[PDB]
């Protein structure tokens, strides 16, 4: 349970983002990075680019995770995602910006110790596919806790549809228009899933604390995308706030 700080940085208003006919805010205009910032940074990392109306991570600028600068709570996110052959990325939700102080200097902690990830992956050609228990490291899974069933991912190079819903602590992941798992935050079963994971209280104290109390006191958090050194695209990014 170390000394941790949560950084509070400016969040944009949703008013600035148009809403579509079904009520979903469009938080990527297909042309610009308005509303987006690199986690732990004051600027869009340069390996993130706009390619053909997609946000794209240029594998091989500075890198790091990219977030949208609005804290969501009850919401339904929809995204399309394409990976290149062997690509790894992911979609983060309820994230917090965290720092610890070691040796009098502030250091950024990764977003994945504060919040869940919906993995993004070429399941056919990437070694993480093999590496969990029961596929919990293949695409759409809650990475290293809960597998996606069914695993209806398309082959690399194609656009996949992702849904992440969080409603009053209930979470559902969607892939290509099926719901593929469900869990419940801030419960003992949640506590348990964490004790089985790499975020176990013994294997990683500060992660367990943040994940068990996911979304802080106010249960709200940033959405974002993972830099994991590989080529990936996202587009049609929209989010409905829930009422
Ligand atoms: Mg990943």
How many domains, the chain? Answer: 1
Residue with tokens 């695409």, as numbered in its chain: 139
Q: Which domain holds residue 141?
A: 4-241
The pairing of beta strand 98-102 with beta strand 4-6: antiparallel
Q: In this structure, what CATH number is given to the domain that contains residue 12? A: 2.60.120.560
Ligand 1 mean position, distance from CA 110 (Å): 13
Determine which helix (DSSP H) or strand (DSSP E) holds 207, and give its type and residue range. helix 205-212
Resolution expressed in Å: 2.7
Ligand 1 mean position, distance from CA 21 (Å): 32
Ligand 1 mean position, distance from CA 168 (Å): 25
How far apart are the C-alpha atoms of 134 and 160, rounded to whole Å?
22
Ligand 1 mean position, distance from CA 120 (Å): 6
Q: DSSP strand E in the chain: where?
A: 4-6, 25-26, 36-38, 48-51, 54-57, 66-68, 75-83, 88-95, 98-102, 105-109, 117-121, 160-167, 170-175, 178-184, 222-225, 232-241
Nearest to 144 by CA among 113, 115, 117: 117
Phi, then psi, of 58 in degrees rounded to 5: -85, 95
Ligand 1 mean position, distance from CA 144 (Å): 10
162 contacts 81 by C-beta, under 8 angstroms: yes
**Residue 148, SS3?**
coil
Contact partners, residue 189, CB within 8 Å, separation at least 6: 183
Ligand 1 mean position, distance from CA 104 (Å): 31
Ligand 1 mean position, distance from CA 243 (Å): 31
Ligand 1 mean position, distance from CA 230 (Å): 10
């Amino acid at each position: 349970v170390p000394e941790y700080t949560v950084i509070n940085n400016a969040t944009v208003d949703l008013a600035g983002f148009p809403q579509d006919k079904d009520g979903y805010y469009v938080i990527f205009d297909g042309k610009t990075f308005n509303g987006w910032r690199g986690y732990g940074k004051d600027h869009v990392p340069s390996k993130w680019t706009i390619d053909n109306g997609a946000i794209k991570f240029n594998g091989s600028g500075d890198g790091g995770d990219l977030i949208f600068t609005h804290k969501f709570k009850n919401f339904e996110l929809e995204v399309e995602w394409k990976v290149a052959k062997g690509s790894n990325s992911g979609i983060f939700y309820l994230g917090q910006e965290v720092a610890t102080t070691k040796d009098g200097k502030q250091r950024m902690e990764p977003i994945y110790i504060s919040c869940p990830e919906y993995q993004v992956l070429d399941n056919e050609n990437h070694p993480d596919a093999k590496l969990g228990v029961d596929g919990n490291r293949k695409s759409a899974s809650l990475y290293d806790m809960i597998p996606a069933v069914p695993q209806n991912a398309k082959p690399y190079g194609e656009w996949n549809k992702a849904k992440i819903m969080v409603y009053k602590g209930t979470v559902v992941h969607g892939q290509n228009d099926q719901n593929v798992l469900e869990y419940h935050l801030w419960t003992p079963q949640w506590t348990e899933m964490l004790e089985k994971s790499k975020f176990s209280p013994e294997k990683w104290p500060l992660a367990f604390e943040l994940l068990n109390n996911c979304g802080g006191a106010q249960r709200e958090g940033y959405i974002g995308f993972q830099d994991h050194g590989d080529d990936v695209w996202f587009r049609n990014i929209r989010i409905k706030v829930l009422d």
